Design a binder for these strands. Structure first.
Ligand SMILES: [Mg+2]
Ligand SMILES: [Mg+2]
Ligand SMILES: [Mg+2]
Ligand SMILES: [Mg+2]
Ligand SMILES: [Mg+2]
Ligand SMILES: [Mg+2]
Ligand SMILES: [Mg+2]
Ligand SMILES: [Mg+2]
Ligand SMILES: [Mg+2]
Ligand SMILES: [Mg+2]
Ligand SMILES: [Mg+2]
Ligand SMILES: [Mg+2]
Ligand SMILES: [Mg+2]
Ligand SMILES: [Mg+2]
Ligand SMILES: [Mg+2]
Ligand SMILES: [Mg+2]
Ligand SMILES: [Mg+2]
Ligand SMILES: [Mg+2]
Ligand code: NA
Lengths: 102, 152, 143, 65, 182, 135, 71, 67
RNA sequence: AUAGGAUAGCGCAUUCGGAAUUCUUCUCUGCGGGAUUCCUUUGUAGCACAAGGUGAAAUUUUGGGCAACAGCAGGUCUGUGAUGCUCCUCAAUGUUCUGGGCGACACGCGCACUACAAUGUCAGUGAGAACAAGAACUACUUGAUCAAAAGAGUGGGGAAACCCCGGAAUCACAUAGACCCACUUGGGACCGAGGAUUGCAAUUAUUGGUCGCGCAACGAGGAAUGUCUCGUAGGCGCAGCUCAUCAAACUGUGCCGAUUACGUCCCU
C-alpha cells in the first residue's frame, strides 16, 4: 500500500538517536514493515573570524562549527496508524516531519 | 603480423582503439565524401575566446566534428554546455593570475547541426543529444578499420 | 557452471579502484573500459603491468578482470588500479584453490613491492591560519 | 688511495657539529706492513660503523676531540 | 612465466656492479621497469641508499620552479638519454651511468683554519648525482642543443674521467685545495 | 620544405614603406607592418591565396602588389567590419583600417582633438600622465 | 650572432645526402651545427632520409627524434 | 586594579573544564565608572546529573575493592 | 599506414541502452574495537634508550583546540542601549539632501602578481579531484544560428534527489603539426577605435568581448634578508568570504611531488 516517510533532524546527536530508537520500538509493537533507519550524511556549518576586536597584534582566528544530524524511516501503514506511533512526548530540539510517498 | 586475432577475439568496437587514430580517420572520411556542411564563419573565427590565435589547421572543423561524435557516443544525452567543458583551456590574462574558461558554445552548436543533417545524431528525449542507430553503426565500423590498419 | 566471481578494492590518496574477477573463456583485463595496451603514458602502463609480470601471465590464464576507479588524479588512479588487480588475484586463489598455491603468490608480490597489497596511508595535511600552506609561515620584516 | 673500514665512531667534533671523528682499520694484504694498522681521522658527511673510506694519505692522525 | 625486469623493456640489469670498492654498499642495482616508485625513502637516516640508482638520477632533474614535481617528464628525458649513451659508447647504458656516479665526486674535502677531511660514502654518491645534473642544466639553458644530449655528454665524459665533464673539473679543484690545506 | 633557394631570394623586402625581414614566415613577416597583427596577417594570406608555410623573401612582385591592395582596403575582399581597427571614425563616420604611417598620424589627431576640446583625457595627455585610472 | 640558413642550397643539400648517412649519432641539433642551417629545416631533411631508408629511427617522441646509420 | 579571591579546587585547561565549571560575568556601574565582577564554581558532580555532570574527572582512576 | 618501432591474453568472442530477481565489496554513520615500549637483542648501569619484530599505524600515532601565576601605563572610548569626567547643541560637531575627496604625484619603504624562454611558446587531441554555496537565489537543455565573440531569449529542475556519471589546472600524446637561440611566434606594460553588460547614477576609463599598438623595461638580479624536515617545500587550479557589479587579498580544499639533515651550541 501507501508508504509514509519520517525525517528526524537535530543539532544534538544524543537526542536524535533517542527519538529514532523510540520510533523503531513503537512501530514494531504495531507489527509494521520498516525500511531503515538510514543515517544521512552529516553537515557542518563553519564560520571563521578574527579574535581581536579592532585591529592590533598577531592576526589570530578562531573557527566555530555546528553539525546537523538526519535520519529517515519508511513505514507501510495508514495515516491513522502512523499518528498513533508518533503520539508520544519527545526531547526538545528535535523536529519530526511526515510525508506521503508516491 | 601485428593485426592477427588474439586468440578467440574477433571484431572491434569503440574504446578498443586509439582515440586519435579513430578521430583522424573519421575526419578524413567526412572531407573525402564532401557531404557535411561547413559554415563560412570557420574561415575567420577562433575556436574559443580563451585562445589567442586561429586553429592553424585548415581541416580543424572536420576534426572537431569527428571529436564531438565520439563524445556523444560515450555520454548520451550531453548538451552544448557539457561539451564546452571538454574543449576548454586556461587563459593568459597578462600580469594577472590565470583561470580556466569553457569553450564557446557557438561552434559546438554548428558541429551538432552538421552531424544531424548527415543522419548520425538526433535530439534525445528529455534534452541533450544522442546517436541514431545509423550513427552507432558508423562508429563501430570505423573502429574495426582502424584495428586492421586500413585507414584512408 | 559456478559463477566463480570475486571482488576487491584498492586505495591511494583519494582514489578508489574496485576490481571484479571472473572466470571466463579467455584472459581480458580492462580498466575503465580501456584495454591495457591502450593506456597512456607508457610509464604508467608499466606500473600496472607489474601485477602480471611479477608472478607471471600463466596465473591469469582464464580470468576476466574489470576495474572501475574514481577520484584522485592521473597517477593516483594508476597505483590504485595495480593494487586492486594484485589483491584480486590473491582473493580468487584463496576462494577456489588451496593454501600452498596462494601463499607462494603472496610471497612474490611482497618481495617486490609491499604496496602491491598494503595501502599507503599518506594523506594531505590540512591548512592552518597564519600560514600559506600546512607549514609555510608568512614573510616577516623588521625594518 | 688505500681503503679503510670504520670500526668505531668517536663523536661529532665540529663547533657546528658537521664533522665526525672515527677510528678506521686499513684494509691490506696479510703480508703487507699495513696489516691491521689503525688510524683516527675526521670525516665529513653522514657515516656510521662498517662504512668504507678512500684515504688519500695514511700518515696523518687527527687530534682527539 | 615470471621474468627479470628490464629498464624501459630494453636494458638488462644482470652483471651490473661498480668497480669502486668503497661505494659498493651505497649504489643499488635492483631491477626495475621504470624510474618511478612512491616509496618513503626519507623516513630513516640511510634508507635512501637502497633506492634504485636511475630513480635517484630522475629526482635530480626536478629542481627549479619549472621542474618541481614533473617526475613523468623526467622519466621521458631519461629514456632518450640512455639511447644516446648507447650509440656513443656501444655498451650497456646502465653500466656507463654506474661508472659516472662512482667517480664524479671528490674523496678529500676541506672544512672549517681550514682543515682537510675525508668524505663518507653516502656523500660521494649524493654529490656525483647533484653535480652532473647541475652541469647539464646550465649547459642547455640558452642553447640549440636539447637537454637529453647535454645530459648524455656529461655522463659519458664523467665515466671516462675526462676533464670536459663539469663534475670532473669541480672534483679535481676541490681535491687540489684540500691537499693544499693538508 | 626541402625546396632549394631561388635566385631572386631577398633578405629585406620593401612593402608599404617598411623594411620586412625575409627570413621569417609570411604571416609573421607581415606583422612587422604597423596596423597588421598576427590575427590580421593570417587573414591577408588566405585572401591572397598564399601558402602560409613558405618563407618570405621568395614572394614575387605580383604577390606583393596583391598583398598591399588587401591591406589598403580589407572590406573589398569580404572582411567583416568587426575585424577592423577603426570601425566608425568620430570625424567622418566611415569604417576603415589604418596601416603604415597612417596609424601614427591619426593617433596624433586624436590627442589634438581632445586637447583643443579641453576634455579631461586631453588634459592628462598634455601633462604626460596615465589616463585609464592607474595610480 | 649565430647565422643559420632557412632554406637549402644546391651544395648543402648534397652534403646532407652524402655525409650525414655515415654518422653514428644523428640529431637535428647536431646537424644544424654541422651544416649551419636552422633546426627547423634540418629536422625536415632528416625525415626525408628516413623515408628513403637511408637512416634508421632509434628513439621517437612528439618532440624528440634520434637517428643512426644503417648497417 | 584587580583583585582575586580563591578557595578550593579549580581546573582551567583542556575541554572538560567547560562541563565541571559554571561561570558568569556582569558589569556594575559605580559613580566613578564601570566595575567588572566574575564568579566561577567547580561543580561537585551528581550521579543523577541534575547538579553537575555524572561522569567523573577525566584524570581520576578508581580501583574496585575486591570482595 | 605516406617511413609504422616497442608494449599482456592465443566448456562459453566482445560491446551499448527495457523488464526482472537477488546482494552489501565499494559510499552513507551513532556507538564500539585497535598501539601498550607489547615481543627480541644491544649499550647498560631503578627510571629508561637504540636497532629489529608484529602490524593499517611503532613512539606525545599525525595535525589542531584548550592552556597556570605574575605583569605591559601594548591596542581598542571607529562594535554595542558598555561607561566616569569634559565639549557642541536650532545656519548644531545632532540629522538628512546635492556635489567633491578618501584613488592626486618627479619620490622613498613593506608585502604580492607576471616574467626574462626550447625541462619552451602556439594549434589540436586524451584521461581525469575535493571542500563548498544556492530564493526554497543557483543552475540544465534548447533557441539565437541561412554564420565572430560577449550577449539576448524559451521551457524544465532544485539542498546524498537539480546542477552531477561535479568533463579543474599542473599532466599525457609514435600529433609522424609550426617556430630554431633572436629582446624572436619570449614578455605584455602603455595607448586608439567599435560594441555589449551591472547600476537611480560608470567622467578620474565599474567589468567582460573584437581588431590594432607592442620600437615599455626585462637576457636571472650588489651589500643584505625570509620560510621550511614528508604527502612536507615548491608548482597547479577550485570553492567560500567581501559582493547590485569588481580578487594580484584572506579562510579552506584537492592534484603533481622532490633535494638535504636526522646534528650542534660557532651566530641569534
Ligand atoms: Mg581537452
Ligand atoms: Mg605564461
Ligand atoms: Mg601571464
Ligand atoms: Mg600563475
Ligand atoms: Mg636547449
Ligand atoms: Mg594539555
Ligand atoms: Mg599607551
Ligand atoms: Mg567616553
Ligand atoms: Mg566603540
Ligand atoms: Mg562592527
Ligand atoms: Mg546642519
Ligand atoms: Mg562630528
Ligand atoms: Mg585608503
Ligand atoms: Mg611544459
Ligand atoms: Mg616582440
Ligand atoms: Mg606571447
Ligand atoms: Mg583585504
Ligand atoms: Mg648558542
Ligand atoms: Na629574452
Amino acid at each position: 500500500g501507501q508508504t509514509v516517510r519520517l525525517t528526524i533532524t537535530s543539532r544534538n546527536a544524543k537526542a536524535v538517536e533517542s527519538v529514532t530508537s523510540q520510533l523503531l520500538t513503537r512501530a514494531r509493537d504495531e507489527k509494521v514493515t520498516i525500511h531503515g533507519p538510514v543515517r544521512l550524511p552529516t553537515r557542518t556549518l563553519k564560520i571563521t573570524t578574527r579574535k581581536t576586536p579592532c585591529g592590533n597584534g598577531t592576526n589570530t582566528w578562531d573557527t566555530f562549527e555546528l553539525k546537523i544530524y538526519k535520519r529517515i524511516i519508511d513505514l507501510h501503514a495508514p495515516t491513522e496508524q502512523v499518528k498513533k506511533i508518533t503520539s508520544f512526548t519527545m526531547e526538545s530540539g528535535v523536529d519530526v516531519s511526515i510525508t506521503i510517498l508516491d | 603480423n601485428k593485426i592477427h586475432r588474439i586468440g578467440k577475439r574477433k571484431g572491434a568496437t569503440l574504446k578498443d582503439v586509439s582515440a586519435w587514430r579513430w578521430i583522424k580517420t573519421a575526419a578524413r572520411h567526412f572531407k573525402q565524401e564532401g557531404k557535411i556542411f561547413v559554415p563560412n564563419c570557420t574561415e575567420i573565427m577562433k575556436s574559443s575566446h580563451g585562445r589567442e590565435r586561429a586553429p592553424q589547421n585548415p581541416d580543424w572543423y572536420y576534426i572537431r566534428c569527428a571529436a564531438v561524435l565520439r563524445a556523444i557516443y560515450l555520454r548520451p544525452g550531453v548538451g552544448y554546455g557539457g561539451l564546452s567543458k571538454r574543449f576548454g583551456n586556461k587563459k593568459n590574462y597578462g600580469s594577472r593570475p590565470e583561470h580556466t574558461v569553457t569553450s564557446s558554445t557557438g561552434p559546438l552548436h554548428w558541429a551538432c547541426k552538421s552531424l544531424t543533417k548527415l543522419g548520425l545524431v538526433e535530439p534525445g528525449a528529455q534534452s541533450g543529444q544522442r546517436l541514431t542507430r545509423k550513427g552507432h553503426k558508423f562508429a563501430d565500423s570505423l573502429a574495426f578499420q582502424v584495428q586492421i590498419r586500413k585507414f584512408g | 557452471y559456478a559463477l566463480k566471481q570475486v571482488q576487491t578494492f584498492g586505495k591511494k590518496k583519494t582514489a578508489i579502484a574496485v576490481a571484479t574477477v571472473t572466470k571466463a573463456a579467455q584472459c581480458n583485463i580492462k580498466v575503465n573500459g580501456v584495454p591495457l595496451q591502450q593506456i597512456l603514458p607508457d610509464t604508467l602502463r608499466a606500473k600496472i603491468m607489474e601485477a602480471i609480470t611479477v608472478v607471471g601471465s600463466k596465473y591469469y590464464s582464464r580470468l576476466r578482470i574489470d576495474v572501475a576507479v574514481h577520484g584522485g588524479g592521473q597517477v593516483s588512479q594508476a597505483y590504485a588500479a595495480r593494487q586492486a588487480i594484485a589483491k584480486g588475484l590473491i582473493a580468487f586463489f584463496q576462494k577456489y584453490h588451496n593454501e600452498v598455491e596462494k601463499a607462494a603468490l603472496k610471497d612474490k608480490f611482497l618481495a617486490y613491492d609491499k604496496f602491491l597489497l598494503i595501502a599507503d596511508p599518506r594523506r594531505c595535511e590540512p591548512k592552518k591560519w597564519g600560514r600559506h600552506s600546512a607549514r609555510t609561515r608568512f614573510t616577516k620584516s623588521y625594518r | 688511495a688505500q681503503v679503510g673500514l670504520i670500526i668505531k665512531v668517536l663523536g661529532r667534533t665540529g663547533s657546528r657539529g658537521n664533522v665526525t671523528q672515527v677510528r678506521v682499520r686499513l684494509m691490506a694484504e696479510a703480508g703487507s706492513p699495513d696489516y691491521n694498522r689503525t688510524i683516527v681521522r675526521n670525516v665529513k658527511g653522514p657515516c656510521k660503523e662498517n662504512d668504507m673510506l678512500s684515504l688519500m694519505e695514511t700518515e696523518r692522525e687527527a687530534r682527539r676531540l | 612465466s615470471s621474468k627479470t625486469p628490464k629498464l624501459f623493456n630494453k636494458w638488462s640489469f644482470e652483471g651490473l656492479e661498480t668497480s669502486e670498492l668503497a661505494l659498493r654498499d651505497h649504489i643499488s642495482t635492483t631491477a626495475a621497469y621504470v624510474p618511478h616508485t612512491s616509496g618513503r625513502w626519507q623516513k630513516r637516516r640511510f634508507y635512501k641508499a637502497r633506492m634504485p640508482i636511475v630513480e635517484r638520477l630522475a629526482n635530480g632533474l626536478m629542481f627549479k620552479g619549472r621542474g618541481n614535481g614533473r617526475k613523468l617528464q623526467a622519466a621521458r628525458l631519461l629514456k632518450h638519454t640512455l639511447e644516446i649513451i648507447h650509440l656513443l659508447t656501444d655498451e650497456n647504458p646502465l653500466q656507463v651511468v654506474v661508472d659516472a656516479v662512482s667517480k664524479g665526486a671528490p674523496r678529500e674535502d676541506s672544512t672549517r683554519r681550514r682543515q682537510a677531511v675525508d668524505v663518507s660514502p653516502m656523500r660521494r654518491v649524493n654529490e656525483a648525482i647533484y653535480q652532473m645534473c647541475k652541469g647539464a642544466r646550465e649547459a642547455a639553458f640558452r642553447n640549440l642543443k636539447s637537454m637529453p644530449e647535454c645530459l648524455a655528454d656529461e655522463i659519458v665524459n664523467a665515466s671516462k674521467g675526462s676533464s670536459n665533464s663539469y663534475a670532473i673539473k669541480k672534483k679535481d679543484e676541490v681535491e687540489r685545495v684540500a691537499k693544499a690545506n693538508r | 620544405s626541402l625546396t632549394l633557394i631561388p635566385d631572386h631570394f631577398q633578405h629585406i623586402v620593401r612593402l608599404l614603406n617598411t623594411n620586412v625581414e625575409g627570413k621569417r614566415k609570411v604571416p609573421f613577416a607581415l606583422r612587422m607592418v604597423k596596423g597588421v597583427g598576427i590575427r590580421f596577417a593570417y587573414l591577408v594570406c588566405k585572401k591572397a591565396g598564399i601558402d602560409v608555410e613558405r618563407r618570405a623573401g621568395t614572394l614575387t612582385a605580383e604577390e606583393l602588389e596583391k598583398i598591399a591592395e588587401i591591406i589598403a582596403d580589407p572590406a573589398k575582399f569580404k572582411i567583416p567590419d568587426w575585424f577592423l581597427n577603426r570601425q566608425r571614425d568620430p570625424k567622418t563616420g566611415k569604417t576603415e583600417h589604418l596601416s603604415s604611417s597612417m596609424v601614427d598620424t591619426r593617433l596624433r589627431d586624436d590627442l589634438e582633438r581632445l586637447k583643443k576640446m579641453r576634455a579631461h583625457r586631453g588634459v592628462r595627455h598634455a601633462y604626460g600622465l596615465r589616463v585609464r585610472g592607474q595610480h | 650572432a649565430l647565422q643559420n640558413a632557412v632554406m637549402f642550397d644546391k651544395e648543402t643539400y648534397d652534403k646532407l645526402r652524402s655525409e650525414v648517412p655515415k654518422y653514428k649519432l644523428i640529431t637535428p641539433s647536431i646537424i644544424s651545427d654541422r651544416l649551419k642551417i636552422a633546426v627547423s629545416i634540418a629536422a625536415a631533411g632528416l625525415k626525408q632520409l628516413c623515408r628513403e631508408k637511408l637512416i634508421r629511427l632509434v628513439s621517437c617522441s612528439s618532440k624528440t627524434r634520434v637517428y643512426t646509420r644503417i648497417v | 586594579k584587580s583583585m582575586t579571591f580563591r578557595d578550593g579546587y579549580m581546573i582551567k585547561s583542556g575541554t572538560a573544564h567547560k562541563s565541571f565549571v559554571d561561570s558568569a560575568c556582569r558589569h556594575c556601574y559605580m559613580r566613578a565608572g564601570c566595575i567588572g565582577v566574575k564568579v566561577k564554581i567547580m561543580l561537585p558532580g551528581d550521579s543523577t546529573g541534575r547538579n553537575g555532570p555524572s561522569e567523573p574527572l577525566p584524570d581520576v582512576i578508581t580501583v574496585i575493592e575486591p570482595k
